[PDB]
């Protein structure tokens, strides 16, 4: 058995939408990671002889957590052996009323401002900022659609609206975000429009941060654009410098700015992020009164992908065989091996094959996994 079509880790769908997922498996000829293959629940799903496992659209009192939120798997088997797919996490989510808000921001004139689209934490996984717009409907910008980093206004990849060098005119404007539910097509304007409240500098203020926390963390994807916020106010208007700690030490290096890594006012943007961009960053903000610093721990995740070589061999008893698991991704918390669908007793890319009997023949699988996703590779040993 082998699949060139395998289900995705995350399956998310509405109560109205429903979903389909197919596992194709090939060879010359579902289950649960809870260990069992269970049949069909009436009207909450079905298996068809066409291999699709289908969750139909359902009224939400018919929501059952043990069906609708669970890990599923796909087992393909034949004469010679069997193999398991990667973990498939099904999440059904009932279409529900939600609102987003833009709260006011309070800034000292001359400083950069950051407007935020406030979204309920419990819908925040399926609801993302599309655009920001004026009182009269004119756009400050549309997220993710092309760019520029030098403008008065910038809609950050993370969805916040960034405003360079605030001035009285900026306080005459209202700011309203448009948001999109990614399970449905639904777009909605925020229930409220935010305003900038600008304080005229009188005396001098050392840099102050929006909160008292000196550390935060954030997660990011490879090939995407990651934003590190540094939110600081001061008069005279401070300058911001970003640094990155050498992994494993307490010392630092200036972040090198170029056409990839960009600084907008105080904010750092890492474009086309790579796993190597992970680390602890230090934002340092200074003016003639004083200075302050804040740390951000960045993790850049990479998709888990695994393939085994040598994939297909012929070995009799007394001789060697070998399988190395070749895998890419970030992070990697665990590495597990599985023989014909049965988890074995050692975790390592290097496994020990010495004296074979044909009890040891089947199809072999190498599993790579982290908190979010898993990746699987299937090999074969013929005798």
Ligand X SMILES: *[C@@H]1O[C@H](CO)[C@@H](O)[C@H](O)[C@H]1NC(C)=O
Ligand Y SMILES: *[C@@H]1O[C@H](CO)[C@@H](O[C@@H]2O[C@H](CO)[C@@H](O[C@@H]3O[C@H](CO)[C@@H](O)[C@H](O)[C@@H]3O)[C@H](O)[C@H]2NC(C)=O)[C@H](O)[C@H]1NC(C)=O
Ligand Z SMILES: *[C@@H]1O[C@H](CO)[C@@H](O[C@@H]2O[C@H](CO)[C@@H](O[C@@H]3O[C@H](CO[C@H]4O[C@H](CO)[C@@H](O)[C@H](O)[C@@H]4O)[C@@H](O)[C@H](O)[C@@H]3O)[C@H](O)[C@H]2NC(C)=O)[C@H](O)[C@H]1NC(C)=O
Which residues form the interface with ligand Y (CB under 6 A)?
15-16, 59-60, 94-95, 202
Q: Which of 113, 127, 234, 284 binds ligand X (CB under 6 A)?
A: 284
Half-sphere exposure of 293 (CA within 13 A, CB side): 11
Asked if residue 375 lies in contact with residue 86, where contact means CB atoms within 8 angstroms, the answer is: yes
36 binds its own copies (CB under 8 A): no
70 binds ligand X (CB under 6 A): no
373 binds ligand X (CB under 6 A): no
- Cβ-based nearer residue to ligand Z, 43 or 303: 43
Asked if residue 370 lies in contact with residue 333, where contact means CB atoms within 8 angstroms, the answer is: yes
369 binds Na ion (CB under 5 A): no
Q: Which of 170, 376, 379, 380 binds Na ion (CB under 5 A)?
A: 376
- Cβ-based nearer residue to its own copies, 99 or 186: 99
Q: Which of 60, 206, 264, 275 binds ligand Z (CB under 6 A)?
A: 60
Q: Residue 121: name its binding partner from its own copies, ligand Z, ligand X, none (Cβ under 5 to 8 Å by kind).
A: its own copies
64 binds ligand Z (CB under 6 A): no
Asked if residue 383 lies in contact with residue 344, where contact means CB atoms within 8 angstroms, the answer is: no
The nearest distance, CB 3 to Na ion, in angstroms, is 5
Q: Residue 234: name its binding partner from its own copies, Na ion, ligand Y, none (Cβ under 5 to 8 Å by kind).
A: its own copies
Find the helix or strand (DSSP H, E) in which 367 lies.
strand 363-369
Q: Which of 10, 20, 29, 57 binds ligand Z (CB under 6 A)?
A: 57
Q: Residue 16: name its binding partner from ligand Y, its own copies, Na ion, none (Cβ under 5 to 8 Å by kind).
A: ligand Y
Q: What distance in Å separates the CA atoms of residue 18 and residue 15, rounded to the nearest whole number?
A: 6
Q: Which of 155, 234, 255, 284 binds its own copies (CB under 8 A)?
A: 234
Q: Which of 246, 328, 231 shows the shortest CA–CA distance to 279?
A: 246
Residue with tokens 């109205």: 16
Mapped onto helix, strand or coil, the DSSP state of residue 66 is helix
Residue nearest to Na ion (CB): 375
Q: Between vectors from CA 350 to CA 344 and to CA 352, what angle results, nearest 5°?
A: 65
Question: Which residues, listed in sequence order, are joined to residue 377 by a DSSP beta bridge?
Answer: 366
Q: What distance in Å separates the CA atoms of residue 134 and residue 125, rounded to the nearest whole number?
A: 26
- Residue 60: phi and psi, rounded to 5, are -85, -5
Cis peptide preceding 347, ω within 30 of 0:
no
Contacts (CB under 6 A) with ligand Z, residues 91-120: 94-96
The number of beta carbons lying within 10 Å of the beta carbon of residue 373 is 18
Residue with tokens 């756009």: 139
Task: For residue 223, give both structure tokens.
Answer: 């090939």
Q: How many residues bind its own copies (CB under 8 A)?
A: 49
103 binds its own copies (CB under 8 A): yes
Q: Residue 153: name its binding partner from its own copies, ligand Z, ligand Y, none (Cβ under 5 to 8 Å by kind).
A: none
* Interface characters, 180-219, with its own copies (x: CB under 8 A): ------------x----x-x--xxxxx-xxxxxxxxxxxx
99 binds its own copies (CB under 8 A): yes
- Cβ-based nearer residue to ligand Z, 95 or 370: 95
- Cβ-based nearer residue to Na ion, 104 or 324: 324
The nearest distance, CB 168 to ligand Z, in angstroms, is 17
What does DSSP say about strands 82-84 and 75-77: parallel, antiparallel, or unpaired? antiparallel
Task: For residue 45, give both structure tokens.
Answer: 């799903």
Question: Which residues, listed in sequence order, are joined to residue 363 by a DSSP beta bridge?
Answer: 380
Q: What distance in Å separates the CA atoms of residue 262 and residue 52, rounded to the nearest whole number?
A: 45
Question: Which residues, listed in sequence order, are joined to residue 285 by a DSSP beta bridge?
Answer: 240, 292
Q: Which of 116, 112, 156 shows the shortest CA–CA distance to 285?
A: 112
The number of beta carbons lying within 10 Å of the beta carbon of residue 39 is 8
Q: Residue 340: name its binding partner from Na ion, ligand Z, its own copies, none (Cβ under 5 to 8 Å by kind).
A: none
Binding site for its own copies (CB under 8 A): 15, 60, 63, 65, 68-69, 92-94, 96-99, 101, 103-104, 106, 108, 118, 120-122, 124-125, 192, 197, 199, 202-206, 208-219, 233-234, 288-289, 297
Binding site for ligand Z (CB under 6 A): 15-16, 57-60, 94-96
Binding site for Na ion (CB under 5 A): 86, 375-376
């Amino acid at each position: 058995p082998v699949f060139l079509k395998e289900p995705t880790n995350r399956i998310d769908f509405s109560n109205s939408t429903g979903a389909e997922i197919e596992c194709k498996a090939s060879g010359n000829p579902w289950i649960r990671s809870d260990g069992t293959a269970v049949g069909d629940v009436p009207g909450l799903r079905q298996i068809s002889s066409d291999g699709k496992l289908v969750f139909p659209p359902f009224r939400a009192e018919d929501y059952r957590q043990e069906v609708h939120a669970q890990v599923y798997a796909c087992l393909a088997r034949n004469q010679f052996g069997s193999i398991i797919s990667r973990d498939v996490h099904v999440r059904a989510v009932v279409q529900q009323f939600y609102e987003s808000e833009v709260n006011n921001e309070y800034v000292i004139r001359g400083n950069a401002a950051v407007l935020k689209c406030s979204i309920p934490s419990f819908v925040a996984d399926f609801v993302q900022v599309v655009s920001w717009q004026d009182e009269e409907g004119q756009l400050y910008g549309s997220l993710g659609d092309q760019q520029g980093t030098d403008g008065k206004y910038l809609v950050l990849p993370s969805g916040e609206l960034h405003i360079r060098e605030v001035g009285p005119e900026d306080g005459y404007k209202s700011y309203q975000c448009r948001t999109k539910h990614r399970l449905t097509g639904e777009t909605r304007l925020s229930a409220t429009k935010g305003r900038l409240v600008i304080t005229e500098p009188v005396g001098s203020k050392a840099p102050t941060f929006a909160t008292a926390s000196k550390i935060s963390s954030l997660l990011g994807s490879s090939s995407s654009d990651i934003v590190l916020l540094c939110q600081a106010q001061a008069f005279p208007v401070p300058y911001t410098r970003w640094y990155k700690f050498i992994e494993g030490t307490t010392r630092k290096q200036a972040v090198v700015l170029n056409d990839r890594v960009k600084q907008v006012s105080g904010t750092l943007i890492i474009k086309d992020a790579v796993v190597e961009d992970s680390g602890k960053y230090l934002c340092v903000v200074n003016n003639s009164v004083g200075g302050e610093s804040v740390e951000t721990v960045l993790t850049v995740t990479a998709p888990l992908s695994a393939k085994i070589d040598p994939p297909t061999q012929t070995v009799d008893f007394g001789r060697p065989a070998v399988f190395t698991c070749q895998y890419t991704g970030n992070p990697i918390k665990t590495v597990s091996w599985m023989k014909d669908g049965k988890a074995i007793g050692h975790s390592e890319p290097v496994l020990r094959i010495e004296s074979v009997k044909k009890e040891d023949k089947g199809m072999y699988q190498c599993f790579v996994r982290n908190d979010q996703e898993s990746a699987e590779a299937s090999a074969e040993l013929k005798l």
